[PDB]
Amino acid sequence: DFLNDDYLKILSRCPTFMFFVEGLIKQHAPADEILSLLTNKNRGLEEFFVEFLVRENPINGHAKFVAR
Partner 1 sequence: QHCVAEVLRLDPQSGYLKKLTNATSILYNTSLNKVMLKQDEEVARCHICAYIASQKMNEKHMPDLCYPKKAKHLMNLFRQSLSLLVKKYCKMTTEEIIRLCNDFELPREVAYKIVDEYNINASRLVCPWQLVCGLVLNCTFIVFNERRRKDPRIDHFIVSKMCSLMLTSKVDDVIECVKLVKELIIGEKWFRDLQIRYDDFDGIRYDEIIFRKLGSMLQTTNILVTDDQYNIWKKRIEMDLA
Partner 2 sequence: DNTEIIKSFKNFILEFRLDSQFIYRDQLRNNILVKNYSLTVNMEHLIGYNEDIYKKLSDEPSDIIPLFETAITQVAKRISILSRAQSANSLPTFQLILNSNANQIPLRDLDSEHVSKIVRLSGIIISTSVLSSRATYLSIMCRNCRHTTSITINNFNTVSLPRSCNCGPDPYIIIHESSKFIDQQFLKLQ
Q: Residues binding partner 1: what is the number (CB under 8 A)?
A: 10
Residue number with CB closer to partner 2 (26 or 43): 26
Q: How far apart are CA 67 and CA 16, in angstroms?
A: 30
Q: Contacting partner 1 (CB under 8 A), which of 8, 21, 42, 49?
A: 21
Q: Is 64 left (phi over 0), alpha (psi -120 to 50) or beta?
A: alpha
Going by C-alpha positions, the residue among 7, 14, 3 that lies closest to residue 47 is 3
Residue number with CB closer to partner 1 (30 or 59): 30
Q: Is 4 a binder of partner 1 (CB under 8 A)?
A: no
